[PDB]
Structures are given as structure tokens and as C-alpha cells.
Amino acid sequence: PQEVSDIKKFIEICRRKDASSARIKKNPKTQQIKFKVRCQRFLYTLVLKDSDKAEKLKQSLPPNLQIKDVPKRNKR
């Protein structure tokens, strides 16, 4: 797993061909949001403070990339 700190590099990673899926994890107790994109070798996580612009980053994300919200319970 790798942290991405640059929004430009995160956008290029999300536009990579081997980016199969992506998910959004909301941590309201720490007031933060995590964008996790699954690629071939690594899972890339971008950590942001929760905000309106942090929500509109999903609009700048590619449309063909499937993006899902992480639920409160990880049902098997």
C-alpha cells in the first residue's frame, strides 16, 4: 500500500489502464476522507480533510473508473 500526497499524481494513477476500481472511505471521527484506487501492484491511498472540494474531486476522477463508498460493515 502506498500513500499519494500529490493530487496530480493521484489523477494520473486513476487514469492508468490497470486501475481496476476505487473506493471512498469517510472517517468522520477524525474528520477526514480517503480515496483508495486499486491498481495491479499497489493500492494507492490519498488522504484529505473532508470538505466540499474533497467531494468534487470525484467529479475530476475518470468516469469509466468504478467508484464505490465503503459501508460501515464489511459483510463477507
Which residues of the chain form contacts with RNA (CB under 7 A)?
A: 1-3, 38, 41-43, 76
42 vs 58 by CB, closer to RNA: 42
19 vs 33 by CB, closer to RNA: 19
For residue 51, the minimal CB distance to RNA (Å) is 23
26 vs 38 by CB, closer to RNA: 38
Nearest to 49 by CA among 38, 35, 64: 35
User: For the chain, what is the largest distance between any 2 Cα atoms, rounded to a whole number of angstroms?
Assistant: 34
For residue 68, the minimal CB distance to RNA (Å) is 12
Q: What is the DSSP letter of 74?
A: -
| Region label for 31, one of left (φ > 0), alpha (ψ between -120 and 50) or beta (otherwise) | left
